[PDB]
Amino acid sequence: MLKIIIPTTMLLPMTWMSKHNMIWINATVHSLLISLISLSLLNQLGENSLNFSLTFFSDSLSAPLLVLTTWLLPLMLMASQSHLSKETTTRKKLYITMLILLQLFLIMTFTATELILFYILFEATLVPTLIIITRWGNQTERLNAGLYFLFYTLAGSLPLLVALVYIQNTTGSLNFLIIHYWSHPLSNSWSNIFMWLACIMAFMVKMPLYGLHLWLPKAHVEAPIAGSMVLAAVLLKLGGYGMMRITTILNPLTNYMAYPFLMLSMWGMIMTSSICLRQTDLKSLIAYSSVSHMALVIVAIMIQTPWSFMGATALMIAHGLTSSMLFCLANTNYERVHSRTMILARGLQTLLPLMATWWLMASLTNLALPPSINLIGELFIITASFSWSNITIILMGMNMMITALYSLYMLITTQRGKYTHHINNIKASFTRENALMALHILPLLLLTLNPKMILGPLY
Amino acid sequence: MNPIIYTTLIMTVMSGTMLVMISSHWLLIWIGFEMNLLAMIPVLMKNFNPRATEAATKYFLTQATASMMLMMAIIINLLYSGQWTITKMFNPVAMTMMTMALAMKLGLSPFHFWVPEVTQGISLQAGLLLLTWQKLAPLSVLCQISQSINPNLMLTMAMLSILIGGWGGLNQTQLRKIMAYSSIAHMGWMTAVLPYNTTMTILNLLIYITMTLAMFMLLIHSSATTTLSLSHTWNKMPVITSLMMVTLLSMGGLPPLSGFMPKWMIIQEMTKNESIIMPTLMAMTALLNLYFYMRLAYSSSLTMFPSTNNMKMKWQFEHTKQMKLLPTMIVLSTLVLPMTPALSSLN
Amino acid sequence: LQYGPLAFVLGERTTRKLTETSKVITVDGNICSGKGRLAREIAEKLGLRHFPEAGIHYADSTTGDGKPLDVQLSGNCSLEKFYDDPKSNDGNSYRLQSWLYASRLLQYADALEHLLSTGQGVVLERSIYSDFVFLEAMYRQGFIRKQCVEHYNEVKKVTACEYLPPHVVVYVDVPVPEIQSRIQKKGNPHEMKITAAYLQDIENAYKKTFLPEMSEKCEVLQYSAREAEDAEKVVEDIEYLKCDKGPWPDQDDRTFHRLRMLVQNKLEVLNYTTIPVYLPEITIGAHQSDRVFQKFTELPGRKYSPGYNEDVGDKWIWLK
Amino acid sequence: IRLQEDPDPEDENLYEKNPDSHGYDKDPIVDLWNMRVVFFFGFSIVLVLGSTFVAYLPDYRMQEWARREAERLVKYREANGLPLMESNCFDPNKIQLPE
């Protein structure tokens, strides 16, 4: 993985010494070649995970997420120099450095072999995101955002650390391959119940589960766009990925304690969706939609069914792409209006036809229009849940319904109407954002064409 | 103070600490403690303000009480055993009395109210000295006699230090007070890991020593004592605040920074000793320390604050104090995690 | 090697170099009361060097080329705005007073360093102890608010006590109506727009607190305009006074070391000039401070440490 | 208002100076060059060439091997009459049953 790690690390000196004008160009292009190199990592052996070294390995679950992060890295670079144009060169270089360190930590996380190293980099993603959210944020509760986000993450992270070190003392090693091959049945002891809770609740905090999901409507809504997309697209996937890794040594106990959280998500995905309907801000609506989709992924994880795992992975990838695109579109409109209430600027479909389209298939993919990978990922989870329990369907059946409502509602109330007369700053569509939504959208349908890649390790 | 006199007093403090860490006779260890106490008071009184007199007093009478208590323990041990050698206590009363006799010196138990007071009253440089050098000696004595500790007492001491330090740090805007409470919390961590493996205690002590050195000399180079004054440093000098926030993230122990390595290793040790509730408790309550660390970081670098016009002249003039070992100290303060197994060198 | 603790340990004292001729003087008086003239005359009559009256850009003179930096970059206040529009919400007047205080503070710092390092005496035009006369005279004229006055007093107490008063100070007594006639004949349009009450208040504040409290700190020499005209007599007066008043005699070499340590670190001297008090004319906003500091950085010779800026003509930076 | 603050700068649109602005930066030449580099690397060698790569990996999950061994053992077992698959994935004889 050092064919991807070493270039990512060496990307830091390039930006840190590039001229006052070349930082954006150089970072964008070289991150694009980094994504190209990581495109190779989609090469997967039939059943054996690709073990590059002792400390680094990859399989059909880590590789798609890694490719997602590496391909994403140019996208924040393209979305940031709009709101980062009027800044000192050193400050811009550090913003870029925060982004590269974030991507590097995500790569080491996804390619980590020992659970402790996975925890180290997984949590270590907090710091660059914290700096991005706090310093470069524009709204008020950004300072409150950082506190909420850090403390919510850590409150689950530390018990996970205690559980992992206890596992190391008892089992012998935290290596994934060992704990899977040398896996042993888990007894229904209450100490084992608390161990399962410690191993689960950190990822479920970052999932998020309903109830303890307040860090997203107070974090993604406030972060700069680059931070917002890197949060929603991948950082949410950290908990799902960790759960998929950890349920190997968390059975057969899970089912007995699967009952509270599963429905907590199942019911929660309704409320969040309902919360999406009666929203006032675009970014908050997208954040709550992300919460609902991630709750569906939670249900997929706790079913522990092959089909559930494949649908889960597909939903993570598709949701990352769709949420990043929706946040980018919201930023474009907000910057054009310097406000975020989704009533101030409506009826812009005529003014910006390409934005009107980009919003149209962004909503369609968010609404999971078949045969997009969003729809197949959702439907696989629906079928797995129905096999696990029939009634789930109606709740599932409710979700996209309400989702569809808001999935079109903002499009009705932001572009499908009459323009506001007193505003005039809406200029011609700068081709930067249009191109950015292109690099968002075309890979989505490309993966729709061949979903065997994002299908996960169960395929 | 005549510079030669200050040099001699510092040498006497260091010689007292060395006498504590090299002597086998109990009386010699007490003599080192006495020399340390005797030479410490003038260092605090160097600036000679009523705050300094107040703090030097409160320092003195607490340390004197602790040292007399330490004699009561030594004399009881000699009476019940007939040995001056620092091996272990042969009378349970003597050791369950010296445990707090050596505790007020560290300032971790409810015998901790003196620490924030003395820290705030005295100058920042002597505060660095008090919070860094004045803790190797009692910790060395505890390390030598760790074989015969009552674990319940020591663990209760460590828990109270952690809890009250983290909570008290939440309600102070003066840098000296919240650093004193942070020192109390780190005392709690090391003292908690003390009974099981003293090597982890030494590792945490070293990390805390270097990292507190870096923090305090950054404070001195910024010439700041209140939160607003430190916040004002961004206009005059931004790199200090930039390093400030990273060192504060290390204070909280957020990995992959250096500050995690003790907090990590300690947790790894006591869970090997079937202690599970305690490590979880400390891991959760370190968030109180982290909260005011992030509060300090927010109003130092992450949000630029209203400055003062006269700083136009402040930018015009550079610094003169060199602050030796600072750039190295930051490096060992943030990135030494990949060299974690090097802790075996201590063992 | 610059003077530090190692020099005292080595044996570098300052009582050895300091002699009777090592005197620090300030020549104080009303506006254009001939204080600069008389200061220069006592300077080269007694053989002592002369630092002129510190102004807006005296600190600009200290660092780098000495050219007066942009007014906005060097304290965003001008004496001309003081003279023309005295009462305005921007509060240029108290900014002027505070910047002048800090400039005179650094002037006194350098002056003290001079006669405590080489032993050559120093002469000055006004100083910290005469700085308050202006601010009080203005405040009495409906000029600034009492919060600015209290910030001035709090900065004075914590940035003047660590220094010690001069050796001798000469007052040139010129009547205020004569000062009004002198400013009439001067010609500069800005000093036309002066209140004669302000000049009388300067005179009052001088010989009501400055000279009285001076008399208990050092030796005062009140000279009339004609009396100060014949400079030879005033220099022979300052020669023969007693030179035995104040904290100057009871000043051991260790307190000499302390005061040299203080003067040699300019950032220490003006550290408390920027105390957080949040005064309406003192708080430069976050955005304004950011832009202005960036502007100061792009100014030549103010980006790196003095002696490292490659843009200005330095050399050997890569082995410096 | 006790806080010397500059007025909020106006929201400056890129089109006023060079109409050909691509919304990247002020200077038209580097703005245009960043256009060329993105429209090259994002689409040409990553989106298009990368799509040829992902559409044309080598054997994925050995599914083709799975089929080309599958019909082989169907031929064998169906020809000899043996059931085309065994209810046990492991031979019961070699498995020592407890008690």
């Binding site: 524009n138 | 805007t173 604050f305 209203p306 | 949040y278 708080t283 906003g285 | -």
Partner: peptide, 26 residues
């Protein structure tokens, strides 16, 4: 223009303690 702390935000913790009570008093 992102929110940069102003005077009233600065005074929220600049003095005694940032959790004022009657015990803080003066």
């Amino acid at each position: 223009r992102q929110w940069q702390p102003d005077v009233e935000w600065a005074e929220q913790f600049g003095g005694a303690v940032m959790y004022p009570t009657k015990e803080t008093a003066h």
